[PDB]
Design a protein around this motif. Structure first.
Motif, PDB file in Angstrom:
ATOM      1  N   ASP A  45      81.985  25.941  -4.586  1.00 12.26           N
ATOM      2  CA  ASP A  45      80.762  25.163  -4.724  1.00 12.26           C
ATOM      3  C   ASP A  45      81.109  23.701  -4.977  1.00 12.26           C
ATOM      4  O   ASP A  45      82.128  23.397  -5.619  1.00 12.26           O
ATOM      5  N   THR A  46      80.302  22.815  -4.519  1.00 10.74           N
ATOM      6  CA  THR A  46      80.420  21.364  -4.735  1.00 10.74           C
ATOM      7  C   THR A  46      79.177  20.899  -5.516  1.00 10.74           C
ATOM      8  O   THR A  46      78.087  21.394  -5.255  1.00 10.74           O
ATOM      9  N   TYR A  57      66.165  27.005  -3.794  1.00  9.10           N
ATOM     10  CA  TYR A  57      66.779  27.864  -4.816  1.00  9.10           C
ATOM     11  C   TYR A  57      66.799  29.325  -4.425  1.00  9.10           C
ATOM     12  O   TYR A  57      65.947  29.789  -3.651  1.00  9.10           O
ATOM     13  N   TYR A  58      67.723  30.077  -5.015  1.00 11.78           N
ATOM     14  CA  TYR A  58      67.797  31.514  -4.754  1.00 11.78           C
ATOM     15  C   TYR A  58      67.065  32.299  -5.852  1.00 11.78           C
ATOM     16  O   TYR A  58      67.347  32.130  -7.051  1.00 11.78           O
ATOM     17  N   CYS A  59      66.172  33.182  -5.394  1.00 13.68           N
ATOM     18  CA  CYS A  59      65.354  34.050  -6.236  1.00 13.68           C
ATOM     19  C   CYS A  59      65.774  35.517  -6.052  1.00 13.68           C
ATOM     20  O   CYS A  59      65.403  36.145  -5.026  1.00 13.68           O
ATOM     21  N   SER A  60      66.546  36.056  -6.992  1.00 11.33           N
ATOM     22  CA  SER A  60      67.076  37.416  -6.825  1.00 11.33           C
ATOM     23  C   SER A  60      66.001  38.472  -6.819  1.00 11.33           C
ATOM     24  O   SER A  60      66.144  39.475  -6.105  1.00 11.33           O
ATOM     25  N   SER A  61      64.881  38.263  -7.564  1.00 10.28           N
ATOM     26  CA  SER A  61      63.792  39.210  -7.585  1.00 10.28           C
ATOM     27  C   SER A  61      62.950  39.231  -6.295  1.00 10.28           C
ATOM     28  O   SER A  61      62.036  40.054  -6.175  1.00 10.28           O
ATOM     29  N   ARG A 109      69.990  23.953  -4.860  1.00  8.09           N
ATOM     30  CA  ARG A 109      70.864  23.012  -4.109  1.00  8.09           C
ATOM     31  C   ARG A 109      70.026  22.042  -3.318  1.00  8.09           C
ATOM     32  O   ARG A 109      68.900  22.347  -2.891  1.00  8.09           O
ATOM     33  N   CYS A 110      70.581  20.857  -3.053  1.00 10.25           N
ATOM     34  CA  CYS A 110      69.897  19.804  -2.257  1.00 10.25           C
ATOM     35  C   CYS A 110      70.871  19.478  -1.151  1.00 10.25           C
ATOM     36  O   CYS A 110      71.929  20.119  -0.946  1.00 10.25           O
ATOM     37  N   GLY A 116      71.704  22.689  -9.881  1.00  8.36           N
ATOM     38  CA  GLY A 116      71.585  23.385 -11.171  1.00  8.36           C
ATOM     39  C   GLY A 116      71.378  24.871 -10.978  1.00  8.36           C
ATOM     40  O   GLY A 116      71.570  25.373  -9.844  1.00  8.36           O
ATOM     41  N   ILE A 117      71.048  25.570 -12.049  1.00  8.45           N
ATOM     42  CA  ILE A 117      70.827  27.021 -11.982  1.00  8.45           C
ATOM     43  C   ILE A 117      69.526  27.406 -12.638  1.00  8.45           C
ATOM     44  O   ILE A 117      69.098  26.725 -13.610  1.00  8.45           O
TER      45      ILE A 117
END
Ligand SMILES: C=CS(=O)(=O)N1CCC[C@H](C(N)=O)C1
Ligand SMILES: [Zn+2]
Length: 140
Positions: A45-46, A57-61, A109-110, A116-117
């Motif tokens: 990751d950078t 963003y990633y949404c696991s649900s 991510r952008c 961020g997380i």
């Protein structure tokens, strides 16, 4: 769950850190919900170095990545949960989107890299612990 792997660092939500993270600790901050531990292997990751307010963003649900507009990092009041008492979580960005315990760790991510997380959310909210000010993640 989820982490950022940059250089020889692992960036996780402080409330999800494992015993191995605490035993290899680099830095932690309860007010930001962040903890960084050292790794043996180098990550891919950078980190973004910018003031973007739009990203994905990633949404696991949902097993889905969502495009979002988000606020600038601020001191937003966070309701009591099983993890912290009611207090001002700092360096937090908000967007409109789904989140459930479970979702903390997902990357935002952008165009420049990782921003961020996941760290907050509910009622169509989703908070993001910013990491773009942590310049030291890029060295050592
Ligand atoms: C109740 C707050 S929440 O936004 O769902 N979330 C739960 C886990 C801890 C989060 C935090 N960053 O303090 C808050
Ligand atoms: Zn950016």
């Amino acid at each position: 769950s989820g982490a950022i792997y940059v250089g020889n660092y692992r960036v996780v939500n402080r409330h999800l850190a494992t015993h191995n993270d605490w035993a290899n600790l680099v830095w932690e901050d309860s007010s930001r919900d962040l903890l960084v531990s050292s790794t043996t292997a180098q990550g891919c990751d950078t980190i973004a170095r910018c003031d973007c307010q739009t990203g994905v963003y990633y949404c696991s649900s949902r097993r889905k990545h969502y495009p979002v507009s988000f606020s600038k990092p601020s001191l937003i009041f966070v309701e009591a949960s099983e993890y912290y008492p009611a207090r001002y979580q700092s360096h937090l960005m908000l967007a409109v989107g789904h989140s459930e315990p479970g979702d903390c760790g997902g990357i935002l991510r952008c165009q420049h890299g990782v921003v961020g997380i996941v760290s907050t959310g509910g009622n169509g909210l989703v908070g993001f612990a910013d990491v773009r000010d942590l310049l030291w993640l890029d060295e050592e």
